[PDB]
Structure formats: C-alpha cells, structure tokens
Design a protein around this ligand. Sequence first.
Ligand SMILES: Nc1ncnc2c1ncn2[C@@H]1O[C@H](COP(=O)(O)OP(=O)(O)OP(=O)(O)O)[C@@H](O)[C@H]1O
Ligand SMILES: Nc1ncnc2c1ncn2[C@@H]1O[C@H](COP(=O)(O)OP(=O)(O)OP(=O)(O)O)[C@@H](O)[C@H]1O
Ligand SMILES: Nc1ncnc2c1ncn2[C@@H]1O[C@H](COP(=O)(O)OP(=O)(O)OP(=O)(O)O)[C@@H](O)[C@H]1O
Ligand SMILES: [Mg+2]
Ligand SMILES: [Zn+2]
Ligand SMILES: [Zn+2]
Lengths: 373, 591, 181, 580
Amino acid sequence: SDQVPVGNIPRSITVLVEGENTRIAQPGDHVSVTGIFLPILRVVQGLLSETYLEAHRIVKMNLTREELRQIAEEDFYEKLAASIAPEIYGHEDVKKALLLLLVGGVDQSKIRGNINICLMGDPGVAKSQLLSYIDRLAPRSQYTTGGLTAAVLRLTLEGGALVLADQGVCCIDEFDKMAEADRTAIHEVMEQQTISIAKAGILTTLNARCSILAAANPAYGRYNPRRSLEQNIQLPAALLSRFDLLWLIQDRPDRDNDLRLAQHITYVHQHSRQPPSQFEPLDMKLMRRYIAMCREKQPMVPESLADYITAAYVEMRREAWASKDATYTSARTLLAILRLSTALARLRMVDVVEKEDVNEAIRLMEMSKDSLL
Amino acid sequence: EVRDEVAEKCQKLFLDFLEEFQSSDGEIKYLQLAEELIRPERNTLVVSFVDLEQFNQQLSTTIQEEFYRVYPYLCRALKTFVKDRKEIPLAKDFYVAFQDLPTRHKIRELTSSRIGLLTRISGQVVRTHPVHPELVSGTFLCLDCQTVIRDVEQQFKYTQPNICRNPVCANRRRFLLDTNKSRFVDFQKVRIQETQAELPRGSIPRSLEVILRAEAVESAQAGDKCDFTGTLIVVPDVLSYRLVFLACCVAPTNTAESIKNQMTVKEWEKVFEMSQDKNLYHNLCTSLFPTIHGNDEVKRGVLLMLFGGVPKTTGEGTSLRGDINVCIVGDPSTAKSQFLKHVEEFSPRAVYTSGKASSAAGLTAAVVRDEESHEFVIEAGALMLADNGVCCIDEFDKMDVRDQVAIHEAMEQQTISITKAGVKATLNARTSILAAANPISGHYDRSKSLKQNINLSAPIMSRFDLFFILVDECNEVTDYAIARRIVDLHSRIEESIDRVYSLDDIRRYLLFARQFKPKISKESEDFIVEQYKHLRQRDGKSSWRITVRQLESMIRLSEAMARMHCCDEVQPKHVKEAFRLLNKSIIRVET
Amino acid sequence: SGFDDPGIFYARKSQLQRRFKEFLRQYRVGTDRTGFTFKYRDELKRHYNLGEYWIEVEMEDLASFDEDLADYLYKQPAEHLQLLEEAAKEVADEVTRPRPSGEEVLQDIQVMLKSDASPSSIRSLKSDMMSHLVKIPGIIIAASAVRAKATRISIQCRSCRNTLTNIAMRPGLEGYALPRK
Amino acid sequence: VIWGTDVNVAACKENFQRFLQRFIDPLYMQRLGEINVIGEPFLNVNCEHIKSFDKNLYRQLISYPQEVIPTFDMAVNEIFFDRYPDSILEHQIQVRPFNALKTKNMRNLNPEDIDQLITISGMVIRTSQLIPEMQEAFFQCQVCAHTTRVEMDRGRIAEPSVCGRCHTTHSMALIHNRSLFSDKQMIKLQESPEDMPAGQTPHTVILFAHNDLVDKVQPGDRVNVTGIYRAVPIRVNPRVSNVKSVYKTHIDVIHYRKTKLFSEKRVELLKELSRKPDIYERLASALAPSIYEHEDIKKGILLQLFGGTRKDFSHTGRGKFRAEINILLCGDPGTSKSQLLQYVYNLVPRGQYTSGKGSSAVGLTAYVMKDRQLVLQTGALVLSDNGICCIDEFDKMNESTRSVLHEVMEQQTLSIAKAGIICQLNARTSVLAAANPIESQWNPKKTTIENIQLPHTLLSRFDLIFLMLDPQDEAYDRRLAHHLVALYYLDMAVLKDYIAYAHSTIMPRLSEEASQALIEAYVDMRKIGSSVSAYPRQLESLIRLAEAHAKVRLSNKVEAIDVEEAKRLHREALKQSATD
Ligand SMILES: Nc1ncnc2c1ncn2[C@@H]1O[C@H](COP(=O)(O)OP(=O)(O)OP(=O)(O)O)[C@@H](O)[C@H]1O
Ligand SMILES: Nc1ncnc2c1ncn2[C@@H]1O[C@H](COP(=O)(O)OP(=O)(O)OP(=O)(O)O)[C@@H](O)[C@H]1O
Ligand SMILES: Nc1ncnc2c1ncn2[C@@H]1O[C@H](COP(=O)(O)OP(=O)(O)OP(=O)(O)O)[C@@H](O)[C@H]1O
Ligand SMILES: [Mg+2]
Ligand SMILES: [Zn+2]
Ligand SMILES: [Zn+2]
C-alpha cells in the first residue's frame, strides 16, 4: 500500500515458486522476494512476451527531541484527533475514536486487540469521506462497498479485501447493503479473526486478522428517533453488538451549528483549506510514525485498575438494567473497554493503563450509547 | 459382406429349436405361440431358456455368452419362422422374449464383464418414463451424390454415416435423414434399484435405468417390484460410456398347497402348529411386541391389519377392499412410532415414513421434470412402493393436503389416477396404512369428539377402519409397569423379549395363512347382520357416528380373523371378536 | 519460458556389428604350437602404427568363423560391409588406444576383402546379382585420373541460412540430391 | 534386476513366499484356507508385517509397488497351487497390501513419492458410478462389415482408418457392446481433517478403484486408503498433443481399511485421576475454563461428550437406540453460548460447527449437485455420523430443516430421495444446539415455546433443555468481571484423551441398583406430575445420562450414583425450564 501513490493503484507480479521454496507463503503475507525477472512466452517489430519473476528467496516480513516534546503534550492525542480529517467540521469525539482504531489494541497474553467500529447515520455526514481519510492515513488498508472474502478461482486461492487487510483496516462503505452471506463472514472475522470459505465444500480457513470500520445509513431516508434501533436499519442487532463501538449520527437541524458548518464550507471553497484550527493538522507521515511508535508499546493492566474498572462496569450495567431498552451491556462491553484503555496507554507511550485512560474510554462508550438517543 | 459364422450357426440352431422342440404333449409349442403371435399387438415370442438348453446346451451357452451378438439374428429367425407359418403382416417387428433363467444376479453383481451377455436380475422400479420411438436403422441421404445411405445402424445415438455411399463423393457432413424409411422401435426408460432384501443395512442402493421395447414397454408400472431378463449394455454419454440393462422381458418379483409343499416339513409343522394353536391371537400379540406393556387392543388391531381381509370384486367391475386402514392417535411418547418401528422392522414389504416428508413424490406418485433429460417422469411414492404391502406413516395429522387428498383417492379406490402436464397414468395401490398421529394440542380431550381432537378430514376418518386413542394416563401402575419393561429392556440388553413365536415362524405363518381365502358362512352372514344390528342399536354418544362403512370394516376384520387361524370359512367366533374390537375401538364422548 | 531448446539426450544391426567386432579382434589363426594369433588385430595394429588404414579380409575365414556373416555379405554386401567398417574402426582404436599426441583422432579404414573362391565369367551376369557381391576375372583396359569424391558433405540454405551438416552421399557413381527448400 | 531398480523377480517372490509361510504375529496360510473355502481370491496383507519380517523387502516393495506386486501374486498362486493344489476359482489369488507408511499428511506430499505405495487416512467426500473403460474395441466396416479388433491402444483407441477385407477408406466403426470394458470408479476424498495440524486449507485427492474394490466405500467414510501414488500429464487441448509441464496426480487404490490408543502411561494416568472422588466435578469445572459460574451446564455437556453406552436392540426388533445425547442451550445473547460451542467443537474430535441459518457455509443437509456429475454433497450431520455437531442459533432455522432435525433425532439417520432412489444416511451424532430468546431479551413468565417458537415435538426430542440467563445482579457482574480481568493477565489434551479412551474401551452396563433407582426416580416424577408430567422419554434421558455418568467414572457399570446425579441434573434442567 505504501508503494502505490494515492493517485495510482496496486499492480500484480506473477511469481513462480518451485522446489523447496514452495509452501513458504500464504495470501496476505507481507513477504519480500528475491529472484530473477525473466520472460515467458505462453510479433510486431519484435516479439511480445509476458514476464514473470522466477523465485529464489522468500522472506515473510512482519525521532527528534521536538517530536518527543509534542508527545509529552497533554493535548497531543487531542491534537492528533483534530488532525483526523480536519476539514470535517465537528465529530471530534468520533475523530478520537477513529484514532483509537488506527492504533488498535495490544493483544496481550490472547486478547482481541482489533477495534471494530461501526458508523450509522443519515447520508451526507462526512461518513464516506471519513473512511477515505482513514484509508489514506492507514499504513495498510483496504476499501470496499459490498471480493470481500476469499475464493477459489478456476484453481487458485484468491483472497478478498478482508484478507488483504491483515492487521490493517478494511474500510467498508455501504455496510447496510452488504450481502447477508458477507454479514455472516465478517461475524466470523470479529469472532475468530479468520475467514472460512468452501467453494468445493472445503472449509479453507485464512488468518484474517484486521479491524473492521463499517459505515451504513438508515433505510427510508434519514434516521427516525421514534423508530427503535434496527427499525431504521436492516442489520442483525447481534452483529451490531459485536462491534467495539457503534456511533449514531443524526441530521438535527441546528440553525447555529448548521450555520457554523456552512461557514466552514465557504472558507474551504474560498481557501481550499479548513479554517485555522487551534492546533494545525499534521502531515500524515508524521501521524503514521506516531502510530508505528504506538504499535511498539504493549501497555499492561495492573490489577489495582481492575477494581475501579469493574466498579465502573457494574455501574453502567446497572444503567442498562435501568434503561427500558437493553443497551447491549455485557462482558463484550467490558473487554472492549479494556482494549480502548490499553489503546489510550499506547497513545500515552506509557506501558501501564491509567485511570484517566479508563475514564476516557467509558466517556466514549457513554457517548456512543448517548448517540443512540 | 462379412458373415458372423457363430451368429449364423446360432440362428440356425435356434430356428431348429423353434421348429423341432416340443412340449411334453409332443407338439411344437413355439408354433402355437407364433400362431398366437400373428395377431396385432403381439410381436414378442416368449421362450423358456431351459428349453433351448435342453434342445442344444451349447446353443444356450453361446447365447448366454454372446447374447448381444446373436439376439438380432434370433429375431431374424423368428421373422422367418413366423412369416412362412401364417399370413403375418410383412412389416411389423418380431422379438424373442427369454425367461426362466436360473442365474438371478443382484445389481451389485453387475460389472463390465456382464456387458452384452444374457442375464436375469431382480429389483424394485423407482420411476418410469414415457414411451418414445427411437431410430435404430437410419436411412440417410447425402446432399451431394444423392445416394440414399441405408442400414446405417445407430448405436443408441445420432450417428451419421461415416462417408458417402459413393466412394467418389466426399460430402461427409450433409447426410439428410429420411424419417419414414429409417427403422424405428419404441423405447421406454425405467429406473430400478435393489430391493430391500438385497440391500445391506445402511448402504446406498444401486440405481439403474432399463430400456423397454415391444410388449415389454408397459409390462411393469412405477413403484413395483419385478424381475428383468435381458443383458447389460453400454451407451455413450456426454470416449465416455454408461451402463443400461435392456430387459427384453420383465416379470413381477417372485395357493396354500404350493407354499406348504415348498415349505419345509419343520416349517410346515410349526405353521400347522401355529394354525392349530388355539389362542394364537393374544400369544402372538405378546410375541410381536415384546417391548410393550398394555395396549393389547393395539397389538390385536395391528395383527388383524397384518392378516387383512379377503379382497373381492363385483360382477360390475367394482373392487371390494380386502385390507384395512388403522390409525393411532396418542399423547406425546406413548410408543406409537415405536409400534410403527416394530411393525416396519418385523414385517417385510413394510415401509416407515412421516407426514412431515417433503420429498418430490410426497408419499405418492408424482410427475416430475427430469434433472438431466428435462422431460417429465413418473416418480413413484412410498405408498406406491408399498403396493400390496404396509405403510407405517407417522405424523398422520401433520400430512400435506395434496398428499391427504391423493391418499384419500387411494383408500377410496385402492388406485391412484394421476394426470399432469399432458402425461396421464393410473397405478394400483392396495396397501394397508398404519397411521400414527397425536391429538390437537398434544393431549386428547376425551370430553371432545375425535373429530374435534384431530385435524383429519371426516372422509379420511370415515375411511379408517379402526382408531386407537392412547391417552396419557396418570395411573402409576401402568407408568411403573412400562418403566420396568423399559428398564429391563435396557438393562437386559437382549433376552428381555418374550417371543413365544419366532419372528420368521410368524412370517411364514402369515404367508401360508395369506394363501387362504376364507369364506363367509351363512351362519356368519346372519351373525354379521345380527352384530351390525347391535352396533346400529347402540347408535353411539360415540366420537363418530355409524354408517355402512362400519359394516365394511367389520366384514374385512372377520375375513382377517378367519385368516388368523387359517380356517377357510368365517365362524361366529370370528365375527363376535371383530365386533368386540371395533365396538371397543369406539370412544364415546366423555363430557 | 520458451526461448531455448534443450537437446534430446540418451536382423539386429548392432548385433551384426558386434559379430564383426568379435570376429575381427577375437578370430584366432595358427595352432597351439604356432600360437593362436589374432591376424586382423595384429595387422590392424601394424596398419595403424603405419599409415595404411586398410585391411585385407578373407571371406572364407569369415565363413569359417561365421558362415551367416559371409552369407549376409553375399546377399547384402553394402550395409554389412559398412558395419564391418565400423567394427574395424572400433577394434583398431582399442588396439591402439594410447596413440601418440594428435594421432588419438581416429581415421576410417578401407576393409579390403578377398575370397579364394573361383571367379565368375563376366559373360555370366544378371541383374539378380545387383546389390550382391560379385567376383570376376579380367584385364584392365583404361584408367582415370585420381580425384577426390565427397562422402561427408554439408550445405547451407542460401537465404534462410539453414545448414544441413554431415550429409552422407553413398559411395559409387551416383549424383547429388539437393533439398527442395 | 529390472533397470534402475534393486528388484529380483525370483528372490523377491521367494522372500515373499517365505514370508507367507514363515511369519510370527503363520496367520497368512490360515486365511489362505479361508480364501480357499470362501473362494474370494484377494489376500490382503498388513505391510508392517513385511517390515517387521524384512524391512529391506518392505523398502523394496514400496519403491516399486507396481513391479513387485506381480511377484507377490505369483508367490501366492503357486502357494495356492501348493496348498489346496486342486480347487476352482473364477480367478487366481490376488493380494491387497495395506498399512505401510503413515505419511498421512496429504497436505505434505512430494513428487519424490511418485509411484511409491502409501496409505493415508481421510474421509471420502464424493464418488461416482463405475466408469466403463474401453480395453478392446471391436470394429466393423461400413462397406463389407469387416470384423476386427484393436486391443488396449494406450488409453486412446487407434482408429483403423482403412478396412482389412475390402480395404476401402475409413469405414471401420467401433461397435460399443462388442468392445471389452472394465470398471474404474472415480472417488474424491478429503484429507482427514483432524489429522491435519493447521487445517487452514483442507486437502482433497482423487482416487480410482479399477475393476475391483468398486463401490465398497460410500461417501463420508473416514477410512485409510492404500494405493500407488500416480501422476499423469494433461493435454493442453484434446486435439493437440501438447501437454502441461505440471501433472495432476491421483491414486489407483489397492486397499481400503475402514476406520491401541496412546501408550501405557496415558491409560495409567487417566485411570489414576479417574479414581479421584471429585473427578466428575473437577472435569466439569476443568471443562471450558474461560467460563465462569456455570456448573450444571458444564456437567450436562460433559455427559453429552461421554454419552450413553452403545446399545444393540436388533434382537428386540425395537430399532436403533439414540445412544447419543442432544442438549439445547437456551439463553440470552452474550451469555457465552457461542464460546461454549466453539470450545467444544475445537476440543472434540470429528465434530462439526454450524449455525441455524441456511447461510451457514457448511450446511446442515446433504443434496445433489452437478459439476456435470450429479453427485451428492454431504451435510454436517451426516459428516458428524459419530462426532458432535455444534449448532448455533438453533432457534432461527427453516421448517424443512426442523423436519430434518426431528427425523435424525427420531432415527439418527437422514432419508434423502436423491433423483428417485432413497438413501438412509446414518447420523449418530450428539447435537449441541444453541438458541437465543426472541426479542431483545428473554421475557419472563413466557414458556420456551413462546419465547423460541418451535414445535413442541422437536424441542421435546431434546433430552436436555438447559436454560441460562444473565441475572441483573451487580455482585454477579462484579465477580464475573474480576474473573475476566484475572484472566486478562488441567490442559485440554488430557481431558480429550480421557473421553476418547472412555468411548473406546469402557462401555457401562446396567446394574439392578441403577435399574431400581431409575424406576424410583421416574415414578416419583410421575407422582409429582400427577397433579408437564413425567414421560418415558424422560426415563430414556435418565437412562442415557446414567450411562454417561457411569462412563465418566469409568466404573464400566451403571451405579446408583450415576442415577442420582442424572436425576439431579434432570431436575436442574426442569428447574431451569420450570414455569408455572
Ligand atoms: N460534518 C461535516 N463537516 C464537513 N463536511 C461535511 C460534513 N458532513 C458532510 N460534509 C460534506 O458533505 C459532502 C457530501 O456528503 P458526503 O460525501 O459527506 O456523504 P456521506 O456521509 O459519505 O454519505 P453516504 O454515506 O449517504 O453516501 C462531502 O463533500 C463532505 O465534505
Ligand atoms: N405403554 C408402553 N409400554 C412400554 N414401553 C412404552 C410404552 N409407552 C412408551 N414406551 C416407551 O417409550 C419410549 C419412547 O417412546 P417413543 O419414542 O417410541 O414414542 P413415540 O410413540 O414416537 O412418540 P410421539 O410420536 O408421540 O412423539 C419407547 O422406547 C417405548 O419403549
Ligand atoms: N457466565 C459467564 N462466564 C464467563 N464468561 C462469560 C459469562 N457470560 C458471558 N461471558 C463472556 O461474554 C462473552 C459472550 O460472548 P459470546 O459470543 O460467546 O456470547 P453468546 O451469549 O453465545 O452470544 P449470542 O447468543 O449473541 O451469539 C464472552 O466473552 C464470554 O466469555
Ligand atoms: Mg414418534
Ligand atoms: Zn456424397
Ligand atoms: Zn471393408
């Protein structure tokens, strides 16, 4: 993905592995190959012949002080969050949540460090645009609309975009209109981080570790608060619970805030730039460097934090029982909160999760629940 | 211009066999069979295999080994034999139908070694296809040289001539067919499979299609069991080939004296003892259902269903039923399906199924598109498979309306006349039906009539001879006794059963008893009348009313009970016991 | 990748060649007193130590050692003579295997042959003996200037450059045979 | 020796003939008598016997199986002409060796093993009809009917292209039935999935039974197939003689082996821990360690793993008994039901995992499909003929599927009217169904039928209905979370071997103590229900549970403790499902 410029697309190279070199790779493996680039003839001014790369060796692969000062800033991650699609006025709490997804979890031991986030809301709310920025920002990513899953072409295993994520992120626009078979498939992905496919009744399983960033809209136009969740959307409610976070966007006509957005748009038209924010957005390369540094960390959970964590968990679970509608609170919700907290600890570059990290994750969890209002 | 000496020699000897061999009378039977065959609708000459063996043993062996090679020559021999013997029409086919072959192979025996040789087999028909004329000897015509190519035999496929009849001409691609000139023979495809006896447990039965021509085209019908004489042959399919058994002649699969003499002396003694055994009624019920406590009326009703009454036909071409229809409605558990499982397991020709069956046949005959051919085929249902048998249908309340009305026609007529998509046919179905169902809401409300307690249509209920209402009793004695029966059954892995009569001994006794056709004594006639006065006098209130159909079930029961102890005449003892069961089978509204 | 062609690697005529080979090298002449010397083997060594590169052959000796081989030479002299030449080539080499430097390259041999049998009259001749060994007397009347005739020949396609090397033109008064294209 | 080999025809035959007569477990000459009496001229051999007797001959055997086998036949035939020198046989004796090399990782196979005998364990997936393969084609001139034959022209049949009597142009057409044929049934078989280490890409191979051993194995049979590995080219087009540089490889089968455990230490170890008084509780708690505060459910599934003893009721005419246990776990979403199925399916051998939806990839049914061979694709239930099928979201299923589940639960087999013919595919599985309440949560005071909406018959067929709910108890939430966060920062192998050995060896038989205890339990339940009362199905469940509980203890006989705990769990399921 890094090789391809934004304006271009990836290009394939057939490679012929032979002898002992065989069986050393799987689809989605970020490998490095050394070998001879030679022609194969499977006649204008000379002969034209397909090329290939005869394989010899295969290997399956995996700042300045001022940068550290910037990291030491308490508003650092907040500044980074503002840098996520700054042209998208508002939704800064969501922008923070996207940042958590990009860093992901820790996968301590194992734990599912992937942070799958689903977005629902009326069309025309930067949703599609947000995914594109994430894919641009993401070090390794895939974009799809709903192929997605693997297949056995006719006689070769061809991996879908879910496989090609491979611990990157598979941005999925038009999520509600996905085929129900694919809905079952992504369910397995969030369950086991694997994709089982059987074209010839052969359940070939592929290690599809990745975080899934879903995007959908309610059917029949804009969202209706009077109509319950899943009344406006045609997805299994269980699958929605599988997502680490689920954020709702509603087109509430707020003349002032709408005017603020209109002012933002006009500036962009008159400047081809967003209005000057408190903290200017940073270059995407710098963001990715911070992310790569964050992947270096694997913060631990001291058992003292567990007492407060459990205290907060039972509190919100009580709120769910108080709520007339079940708010999907379960052990899944607790585990996700653990992922967010250690993810925040990665942003802090601190190998211990803080009470602050736990509290903020609960705040985002509450806001996501509050988005269901 | 090359003569097959072996086939020519076989043809001459076969012609010698026709025109010299004779019956025990000393007259040429085959001249008389040919004399019968001169009529229209008659072209297959039935011939016994052993006779040609006796006339010439080597002729039979050569025909056995080289049946495909020599059989066309035998047809020519019959044509020469029949043409000069009488004023036969000059243009109609003639066939030699072979039978009485001792070698009765199973389908599993069939191999590539058996291609082209005569052989006999036995099995059960699965589905039957329409009749179709098929070209056998093409009469083509090249476009260029205009030489009418004739006698270009087709090996069961559209095989054009290799080249022009004129050696000079090399069209090779534009042989126009002459439909009228080309010889045609009617072929009907029919699917067959291994019978249950030949089928190992838990093994998928083999399936094979057979080509039927001449009088053998409609010799059989869908869903029956038959023995097929002919040869296995190869047909190309889309150098691929596939195996089909062209059955030149087909017969159905396999008197009291004949069975008794065929029966061994020890089997004869056991069967005669069983008939001589008084009170065989209850003792056989206990033996037939060892893992059962109580419900002896069910055991008695089932046993009478197994024997069945004497079927009769009026002078007006109307059939009076011999068998009966018995239904069991009971609460959850209560051993209905277990009763059906015992019946199906013990009885041959007994097939178990459920009213929830969603197969294409749907328990009865159906006209269904072929997956490959795309034409419709007559697929027999399990009711048709159980023709002259027993059907242990489960969930009878949970049947389909199409199946229900189709089943209603079957019990009404003992036949089903099916017509769809232009295809039309009718199939005999003389099957005793053992229906198992449950009351509405699972539990039988005895304060409600039986019609209220089940969803079955009134005509269906009217056409059922007997009903057994098995209510879930809270009585601890029955519950404890059943528990001991089940626990001893489970704990004593075998020998828990008490079979006073061995299962095979019962089966041969059923066969020997079935050879009888018990008559109605004038004593039984008036006693049947007198008992029907009692039932009419009773006039209830019953869960269902009384009609002439009750008398019909009564006489069919009495005929069965005269068949129970092999007596060839009904007695008042048989009639009163039948009256006892059916009257007890009436459950009055307990409101 | 198809751009290069690997080279294919690896009554009975070879049996007949073996029969000549054993005959030439293993034929013994003389007796126990005089030694059972190998006439052809010794003469071949003499002849290849010298520059002779030919050998006389006694058809009767071949007949005595192997009647069938002589009969084949009578019937079909040309082919069996050629095989006999190859055997003569082989046996000469192994006899003189450690030749001096440069001389290890091998030269063909004219297997001259003689028969003590009587001649046949030239007037007694027919096409039946065409492609058959013949023997006749006479006196020579004329001779031609010695020249060189080509046996191993090679040609090149003038335009396509297709070269056809090591072509054998059969010995005798036959013409050439060019390719069609 | 034959070129490129170390193989002497006489010495190899003599050594093999010596091995037949001289052997230490002599059994070969005894089964020769069985073949002589029976007349079945195929003398199957365990190749490991040849390895033990002579490893070099065994090594020599595997290296050139096609060449050595005719020597083996000649050895046995002359032995048959020695022992029973006079007899009648439609063909002389043959040999079908087997069980030689357990390099059964078919995913790990190399071109080094081409034309080398091997045996591999796997499950046949698809089969076909026996292919009538031409071996000698009779021919007849269109002009003069010139009779002639061409015999085994290397797979293809060489057309004459010219007559022999009239010597015209191409006029000799093949006569199909006059030609000679043999049987070659093609079979497609999948690598034994449990044997595979990763299972990320299950392997499939084609097999061929040539004129023998044809149709003997039906789809779904997990067997060891022994035959010669073989590879052939494929023409780039049928018309052109060019071929691919890659060869598609298949097997010409020689023998099908339909199919001790571990070593002495493991049987000693499992028997040692079986003696622990709380092995039943420890094994239940040890089962699925990630679960918390679930013991009745764990014990019930544990009894389903062990299952009841196999019972042959053929003599009684009662039909096959449902020796397997079927448990339906009904509970709110997010209550670890899916994890339980995944843990059991991952742990259990030869098990299957599916979902109630028809969108499940595996599919819980079998049906025909055309390539264009209309061949049967199996189902998970048929696939798990002796294993366990973990079915998720059992509430959400089609009525046609529900009818199938009723049938197999009623019969432990599946009837399919393929084309027109009917086949009864045995499925003696253990069904671990999982269902969730309708609506967002389970509405209290509503019966399982109301809150799951399934037929009373089908749910009644489930011997156990375990109801679990997430209580609204913050203390339970607190303890559960602390358990999880504790997990945040006995091995299954020993338990799996315990269950497998108990299945393999221990077969509990009833004791009159168990008989009377069960009868007392049922009549007590009847009396309690006299005022959803007791049913003999409940007795059958209690029968099966006591067998499983006895199997857990490895007593090899059903004891009163098995009955007492079985009644306790049965009452617990009633208590979980109690509603009135
Ligand atoms: N909150 C926002 N801030 C800035 N621009 C916005 C915002 N919401 C929407 N837009 C603008 O809306 C324009 C068109 O709508 P947009 O592409 O965002 O739709 P979308 O939300 O992806 O819709 P859908 O999912 O229905 O296709 C985009 O150019 C984007 O700049
Ligand atoms: N009256 C009885 N005497 C003996 N055994 C009985 C009796 N009633 C039931 N049983 C036992 O009950 C066990 C379970 O019953 P079974 O499964 O055969 O019921 P079923 O008739 O198929 O039920 P349903 O169709 O109503 O679901 C059977 O093994 C049978 O042994
Ligand atoms: N009693 C419990 N003990 C331990 N873990 C539990 C318990 N209840 C819930 N969990 C945890 O809650 C999560 C439930 O995930 P899972 O998908 O298995 O739930 P489920 O109830 O089967 O869901 P569904 O019915 O929606 O498919 C898992 O982390 C499981 O470990
Ligand atoms: Mg039943
Ligand atoms: Zn022509
Ligand atoms: Zn000819």
